[PDB]
Design a binder for this molecule. Structure first.
Ligand SMILES: C[C@@H]1O[C@@H](CC(=O)O)[C@@H](O)[C@H](O)[C@@H]1O
Ligand SMILES: *C(=O)C[C@@H]1O[C@@H](C)[C@@H](O)[C@@H](O)[C@@H]1O
Ligand SMILES: *C(=O)C[C@@H]1O[C@@H](C)[C@@H](O)[C@@H](O)[C@@H]1O
Ligand SMILES: *C(=O)C[C@@H]1O[C@@H](C)[C@@H](O)[C@@H](O)[C@@H]1O
Ligand SMILES: [Ca+2]
Ligand SMILES: [Ca+2]
Ligand SMILES: [Ca+2]
Ligand SMILES: [Ca+2]
Ligand SMILES: [Ca+2]
Ligand SMILES: [Ca+2]
Ligand SMILES: [Ca+2]
Ligand SMILES: [Ca+2]
Lengths: 11, 114, 114, 114, 114, 11
């Protein structure tokens, strides 16, 4: 949920 | 292979308990003889108990655990372990995403009770 | 053989949850590297959760579960099961009497969390 | 707790296989319905198979594994694991000495066959 | 979930043994650190041992079991179980057809040895 | 416990 989206706009 | 399905002895009381470890809200459905017998929902990233209940395995003994996040089925892993030929655990892990920690909802079924 | 002792990964958070199925009040002690980290107490013949907590496995990762009833150590049975090479359960049953049901206190340790 | 005793489905063929990891010669006795059904005896420190056989669990389904070395019973550890609600393993470890590796004879029972 | 993959302790000897229960000839590949380390083949409907070998888990400890029949990968089920915090079993079942017995090739990995 | 005990004798 919360986590992957934040790793998504990233690496 | 099918996961989350267990044949308990017929007419046997069992405990079912679910824990959550995910940003997604977990929905745990427990079916007995293919009919919903309990549903737990909750959200935690700290192993909170989102439900615990005593159920009866009924005439068939068939118990199925389904886990979904907002209706999307999670990938399940499961096994049954029996200690000293008496104490039964039916164990479910589930993965709602990509990190493969399989803890997003953790479900433990135990029997016998009492 | 020794029962109720598990080597977790060092410095790792884990859940520990106890259920009771006995006329006797159950005292569940959880040791992290030989020091009491949590103690649960309660009485149920219906699988009530008598405690749930998140602990850190400490320097050694060694976690030990002890169960007593009015100070008398129960006989333990245990095993660890790993699903999909990721999800770990350390399982304990305990027997305080003569019926060999091993459910008098049932303890489930699970990791990883989060 | 009792170890090495398993209730199999009755009248069901099962495999039993023993491996040795000890300087002592291992004698593995497999009882069905309290009567000796197979005996394996061998010595290896390299996990050699000292016996494998197909048996039938009979009307009771009761299967018991005993391990001895030079006539001295070994200390046993055991559990049963079920995968996808179908594939069963009854597992036994045994210790004949003081190093607590519990591998001195390792016994695997598996069913169904065929 | 991924099945048939286990992280063993690194640089550790382990046993791997395959049994067959199918009309089809089973090919069991055992990879260590992603490279083939052993290949067993054989055919049995009576639980014959189609291979047994001692391998070293290498620097990574990563062990993977793959099963093929008819030029297609079998569906795998697996789990790891630890008894008395010492004796390890990594268990694999596989299904090459439509009956879901999951015994068509059964693979048992055990450690420690010696 | 005493539950079993109560019928250790009663039974
Ligand atoms: C080689 C040794 O043999 C035994 C003791 C002597 O004898 C076993 O108990 C040990 O685990 C080890 O395998
Ligand atoms: C969404 O972020 C993914 C989800 O929640 C994370 C906090 C973590 O628990 C992950 O395992 C889970 O799949
Ligand atoms: C193909 O025949 C199916 C196959 O062989 C059978 C004898 C039985 O073992 C079945 O499980 C296996 O898939
Ligand atoms: C004493 O009564 C024995 C005790 O409590 C019973 C109700 C039952 O749970 C039994 O298993 C437990 O040892
Ligand atoms: Ca996850
Ligand atoms: Ca998670
Ligand atoms: Ca009891
Ligand atoms: Ca009880
Ligand atoms: Ca030994
Ligand atoms: Ca040994
Ligand atoms: Ca099959
Ligand atoms: Ca088969």
């Amino acid at each position: 949920x919360k986590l992957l989206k934040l790793l998504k706009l990233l690496x | 292979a099918t996961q989350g399905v267990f044949t308990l002895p017929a007419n046997t009381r069992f405990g079912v308990t679910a824990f959550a470890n995910s940003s997604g809200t977990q929905t745990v459905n427990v079916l007995v003889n293919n009919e919903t017998a309990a549903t737990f929902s909750g959200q935690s990233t700290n192993n909170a108990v989102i439900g615990t209940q005593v159920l009866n395995s009924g005439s068939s003994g068939k118990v199925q655990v389904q886990v979904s996040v907002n209706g999307r089925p999670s990938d399940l892993v499961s096994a049954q372990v029996i200690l000293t030929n008496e104490l039964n655990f039916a164990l479910v892990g589930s993965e709602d995403g990509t990190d493969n920690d399989y803890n997003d909802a953790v479900v433990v079924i135990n029997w016998p009770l009492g």
